[PDB]
Amino acid sequence: SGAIYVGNYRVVNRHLATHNDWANLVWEDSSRDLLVSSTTAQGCDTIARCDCQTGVYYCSSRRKHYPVSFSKPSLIFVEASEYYPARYQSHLMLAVGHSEPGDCGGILRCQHGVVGIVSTGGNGLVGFADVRDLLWLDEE
Ligand SMILES: CSc1ccccc1CC(=O)N1CC(O)C1
Ligand SMILES: [Zn+2]
């Protein structure tokens, strides 16, 4: 589990969105595994606007933050899970790092701010849904 709280937005994995998220929906995209809902309180996270390929992510199944090198956002075939059949996921970045299904939502961050959230993984890989191209998260 986990979310990004920026401005009056809450960014979560679409497959973990709650009824309150769907009832306060701003934007969702199944191919990216992302959903954004509106919040009453202002959040403290800031989004990175960069092309970093090194950062740190939080892994709840280890209660630890790990440094990682990650790929650029791309269209990758992701195996079937409890939440989606096997399909192509867009804006996804891969790294070598531990992950389990419930690690989805952990933040990946670089020197500039939040880069994305854990979305996929297995066998010593972890994939992150990028949010750096969603410029509208910084306004309204
Ligand atoms: C960190 S996810 C993970 C990790 C290890 C093993 C399996 C998973 C589940 C997974 O691939 N998915 C949830 C959906 O969005 C795609
Ligand atoms: Zn950066």
Q: Which residues are catalytic?
A: 15, 33, 104
Torsion sign over Cα 35, 30, 14, 12: negative
Q: CA-to-CA distance for 131 and 111, rounded, in angstroms?
A: 15
Residue with CA at minimum distance from ligand 1 atom 16: 120
122 CB near ligand 1 (under 6 Å): yes
Based on the number of CB atoms within 10 Å of its own CB, is 45 exposed (0-12), middle (13-18) or buried (19 or more)?
Answer: middle
- Closest by alpha carbon to 110, among 46, 52, 29? 52
Q: What is the residue whose two structure tokens read 């961050």?
A: 109
Which atom number of ligand 1 is nearest to the Cα of residue 79? 11
2 CB near ligand 1 (under 6 Å): no
Tokens of 15: 């497959």
Element counts in the chain: helices (H) and strands (E): 1, 10
Torsion sign over Cα 97, 101, 103, 109: positive
Ligand 1 centre distance from Cα of residue 81 (Å): 6
45 CB near ligand 1 (under 6 Å): no
Q: What is the resolution of this structure in A?
A: 1.2
Tokens of 140: 């309204």
- Closest by alpha carbon to 13, among 114, 120, 125, 98? 120
Based on the number of CB atoms within 10 Å of its own CB, is 92 exposed (0-12), middle (13-18) or buried (19 or more)?
Answer: buried
Q: CA-to-CA distance for 123 and 70, rounded, in angstroms?
A: 16
SS (HEC) of the chain: CCCEEEEEEEEEEHHHCCHHHHHCEEEEEHHHCEEEEEEEEEEECCECCCCCCEEEEEECCCCEEEEEEECCCEEEEECCCCCCCCEEEEEEEEEECCCCHHHCCCEEEECCEEEEEEEEEECCEEEEEECCCCHHHHCC
* CB neighbours of residue 21 within 10 Å: 19
Which atom number of ligand 1 is nearest to the Cα of residue 15? 15
